[PDB]
């Protein structure tokens, strides 16, 4: 089979600068009919990939002047020029000129930006949950830049890491941002033996870290 | 423009089978070929076979054995069908015009989620996320939904019936207890909610269940 390996895994790229692409193959790709089939898709976050060149070098109609293939043999490269926050997500190289068809692993183009504190709030459990037996409490970690965070919760002042499950948003396209999810899971019995419970963010953009709480006999 | 419309199962039983029809519409079966391709996390995109205009087939040989895709022109149908499936068979099955020479009918469709599991069908339960009765209240108020316990995925949440797109996170589903959970997150103004109603709806597919949750102050 055709191994297409693409560099680099990650590129993170500023607003309007270019960004350089790389898959080479194992060996040459030229169809018995004589085309290079070597295509390159965006893979936007939530949708399906999407053909910008085919042949090496052409656009497909439609795409924007700003993409560009070239190479040959066993070299080639995508070329993004001023680049804009909608062009994130993962660029695959493909080839279809020899059976089995192969596509590269991928390359993830972030985009950088200033750096944008976390907006955190918390949610007790809902009065519905409670009813059924159940008390998720549940914080939102949002549009914040770079994408490294930490999240600790204290109950009564303890830290607690066990019941936590933690999920991330890929890159928004309109503010290049990020985003968390964190929810603290117990029975509803657990709940109410406590009263104070607090969603710890900490990020680089503050020295302290960013503080949600409530108490259980206060609502 | 072209469409390639799926329908097919998102939760075949291990050692099964996985049938999926595309739709096509947009050019004609009889001068075009069809792809088939996967996804998944582990192994990223795999290309599985290609049905050529004239009938002619080619496959992966890593999944010759167990693979089979026909067609109907007249109806402009294409099916994929893959036998003894095992969990490593999990990932979103896409029909697929690529590898273009001349023409403009390029196209991915939405893809089909298979999940390779003997666990059984749940439908969600839904909570509304309201901020707590003492909480302060900001400019832009943050509400959301929690959607608990189902299995397989895929639901879909939106906001006052899809009009409400804009702020709105819907994070990754995370399996826990052998059932997925995740939440969506929406900011709005201040100014709007409460005066103004928000609803997340949760739709889960292979249960057949909407589901309505009104966010109501505490
Ligand atoms: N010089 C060419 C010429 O020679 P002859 O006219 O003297 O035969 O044509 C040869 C092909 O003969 C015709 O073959 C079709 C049947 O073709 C297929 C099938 O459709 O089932 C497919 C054949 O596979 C190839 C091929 O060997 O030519 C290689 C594949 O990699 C692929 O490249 C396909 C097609 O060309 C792909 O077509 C598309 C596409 O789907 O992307 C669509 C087209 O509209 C067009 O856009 C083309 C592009 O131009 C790229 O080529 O892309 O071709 C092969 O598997 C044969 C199999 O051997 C059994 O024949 O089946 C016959 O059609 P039917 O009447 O419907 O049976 C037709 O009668 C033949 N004349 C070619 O090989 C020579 O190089
Ligand atoms: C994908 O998985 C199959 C199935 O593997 C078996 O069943 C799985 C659910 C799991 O329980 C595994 O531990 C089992 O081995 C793999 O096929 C098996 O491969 C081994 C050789 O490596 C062989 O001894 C078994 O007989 C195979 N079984 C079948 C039904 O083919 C398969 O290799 C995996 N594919 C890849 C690409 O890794």
């Known amino acids: 089979d055709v191994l297409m390996t693409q560099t680099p895994l990650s590129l993170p790229v500023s607003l309007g600068d270019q960004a350089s692409i790389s898959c080479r193959s194992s060996?040459?790709?030229?169809?018995?009919?004589?085309?290079?089939?070597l295509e390159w898709y965006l893979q936007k976050p939530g949708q399906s990939p999407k053909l910008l060149i085919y042949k090496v070098s052409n656009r497909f109609s439609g795409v924007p002047d700003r993409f560009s293939g070239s190479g040959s043999g066993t070299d080639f490269t995508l070329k993004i020029s001023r680049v804009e926050a909608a062009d994130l997500g993962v660029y695959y190289c493909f080839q279809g000129s020899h059976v089995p068809y192969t596509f590269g692993g991928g390359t993830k183009l972030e985009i950088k930006r200033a750096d944008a504190a976390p907006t955190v709030s918390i949610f007790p459990p809902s009065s519905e949950q409670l009813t059924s037996g159940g008390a998720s409490v549940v914080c939102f970690l949002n549009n914040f830049y770079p994408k490294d965070i930490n999240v600790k919760w204290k109950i009564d002042g303890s830290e607690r890491q066990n019941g936590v499950l933690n999920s991330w948003t890929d890159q928004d396209s309109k503010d290049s941002t990020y985003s968390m999810s964190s929810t603290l899971t117990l029975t509803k019995d657990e709940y109410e033996r406590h009263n104070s419970y607090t969603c710890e963010a900490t990020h680089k953009t503050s020295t302290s870290p960013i503080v949600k709480s409530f108490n259980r006999n206060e609502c | 423009q072209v469409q390639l419309q799926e329908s097919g199962p998102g939760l075949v039983q291990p050692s099964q089978s996985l049938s999926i029809t595309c739709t096509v519409s947009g050019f004609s079966l009889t001068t075009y070929g069809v792809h088939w391709v996967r996804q998944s996390p582990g192994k990223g995109l795999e290309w599985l076979g290609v049905?050529?205009?004239?009938?002619?087939?080619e496959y992966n040989a890593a999944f010759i054995s167990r693979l089979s895709i026909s067609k109907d022109n007249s109806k402009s149908q294409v099916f994929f069908k893959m036998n003894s499936l095992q969990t490593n068979d999990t990932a979103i099955y896409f029909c697929?015009?690529?590898?273009?020479?001349?023409?403009?009918?390029?196209?991915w469709g939405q893809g089909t989620l298979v999940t390779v599991s003997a666990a059984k069908t749940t439908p969600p339960s839904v909570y509304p996320l309201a901020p707590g009765s003492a909480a302060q209240t900001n400019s832009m108020v943050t509400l959301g939904c929690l959607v608990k316990g189902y299995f397989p995925e895929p639901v879909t949440v939106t906001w006052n019936s899809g009009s409400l797109s804009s702020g709105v996170h819907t994070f990754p589903a995370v399996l826990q207890s052998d059932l997925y959970t995740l939440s969506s997150s929406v900011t709005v103004p201040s100014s709007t909610w409460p005066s103004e109603t928000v609803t997340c709806n949760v739709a889960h597919p292979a249960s057949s269940t909407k589901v309505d949750k009104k966010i109501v102050p505490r």
């Open positions: 060996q040459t790709i030229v169809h018995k009919n004589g085309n290079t089939y």
């Open positions: 697929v015009r690529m590898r273009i020479t001349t023409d403009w009918f390029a196209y």
């Open positions: 049905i050529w205009s004239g009938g002619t087939t």
